[PDB]
Amino acid sequence: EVQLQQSGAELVKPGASVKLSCKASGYTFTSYWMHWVKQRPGRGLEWIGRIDPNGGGTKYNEKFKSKATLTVDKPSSTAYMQLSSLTSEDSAVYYCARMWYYGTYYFDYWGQGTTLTVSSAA
Amino acid sequence: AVVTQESALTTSPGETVTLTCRSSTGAVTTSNYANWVQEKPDHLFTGLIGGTNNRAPGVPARFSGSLIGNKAALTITGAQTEDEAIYFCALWYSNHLVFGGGTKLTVL
Numbered sequence: 033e034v035q036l037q038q039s040g041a042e043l044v045k046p047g048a049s050v051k052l053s054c055k056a057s058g059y060t061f062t063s064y065w066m067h068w069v070k071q072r073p074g075r076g077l078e079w080i081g082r083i084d085p086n087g088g089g090t091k092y093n094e095k096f097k098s099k100a101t102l103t104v105d106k107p108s109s110t111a112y113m114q115l116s117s118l119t120s121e122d123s124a125v126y127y128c129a130r131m132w133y134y135g136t137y138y139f140d141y142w143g144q145g146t147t148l149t150v151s152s153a154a
Numbered sequence: 155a156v157v158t159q160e161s162a163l164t165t166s167p168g169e170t171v172t173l174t175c176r177s178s179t180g181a182v183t184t185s186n187y188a189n190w191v192q193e194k195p196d197h198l199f200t201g202l203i204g205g206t207n208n209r210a211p212g213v214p215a216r217f218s219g220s221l222i223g224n225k226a227a228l229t230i231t232g233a234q235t236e237d238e239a240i241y242f243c244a245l246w247y248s249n250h251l252v253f254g255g256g257t258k259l260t261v262l
């Protein structure tokens with residue numbers, strides 16, 4: 033019943049910006065943190081940061097602070113992640129993952145992921 | 155910090171296998187709140203354990219977490235064929251999270 037639906041594949045030009053979405057459903061949105069994670073081939077997983085849908089407080093990996101902007105929209109139960117000044121290093125699969133943070137910290141449900149390809153117009 | 159996991163491990167059905175998660179900074183502690191997540195083909199991720207030893211809801215009990223010596227460990231007691239996957243551990247370092255490189259588990 034808990035579901036995290038992320039937006040479709042994206043193709044964007046270098047230097048541009050993009051906004052990815054993560055639609056949450058089947059639970060109380062504001063009760064869980066939402067993380068964003070970056071996956072590139074041979075590069076395992078990279079943590080981008082998390083957002084608390086309750087107050088929209090964020091925590092970032094230093095390496096992504098100037099790269100990513102996390103927000104939420106309570107009404108639509110959607111978490112967004114904007115990525116700016118795109119380069120080919122940003123090409124990857126991006127996931128949103130929910131976390132329970134009371135008494136412990138654990139991920140449970142993950143989105144299916146969104147593929148981003150940063151591609152120059154020929 | 156660099157988080158290290160076994161590159162790949164092989165087990166047979168019904169056996170017990172232990173995956174480890176090492177921290178380059180020193181011993182892993184409960185304050186690293188070790189997480190373990192499972193990736194299955196088709197980019198299908200599932201959180202298993204968080205805070206060293208707490209299982210997310212619906213996760214089979216055969217998956218358990220602990221600290222063994224200097225490392226965080228994920229033990230799978232009675233490996234199942236469906237357990238064949240890539241397991242990532244992640245350690246919390248007082249403000250950010252680091253993922254290990256993942257362990258590919260093969261079940262014979």
Ligand SMILES: O=C1c2ccccc2C(=O)c2c1cc(S(=O)(=O)O)c(O)c2O
Nearest residue numbers: 082091137138186187188189205246251
């Ligand atoms: O302990 C964690 C933790 C442990 C394991 C995986 C992930 C996290 C995590 O994401 C996190 C944590 C603590 C803080 S706290 O100092 O603010 O309370 C955060 O802000 C935060 O985002």
Ligand SMILES: C[As](C)(=O)[O-]
Nearest residue numbers: 144145146147197
């Ligand atoms: C839904 As996806 C496979 O772009 O990995």
Ligand SMILES: [Cl-]
Nearest residue numbers: 049050051114
């Ligand atoms: Cl945008």
Ligand SMILES: [Cl-]
Nearest residue numbers: 078079252253
């Ligand atoms: Cl990371």
Ligand SMILES: [Cl-]
Nearest residue numbers: 240255256257
């Ligand atoms: Cl891997």
Ligand code: NA
Nearest residue numbers: 076240255256
């Ligand atoms: Na991998």
Ligand code: NA
Nearest residue numbers: 159161255256
């Ligand atoms: Na590895």
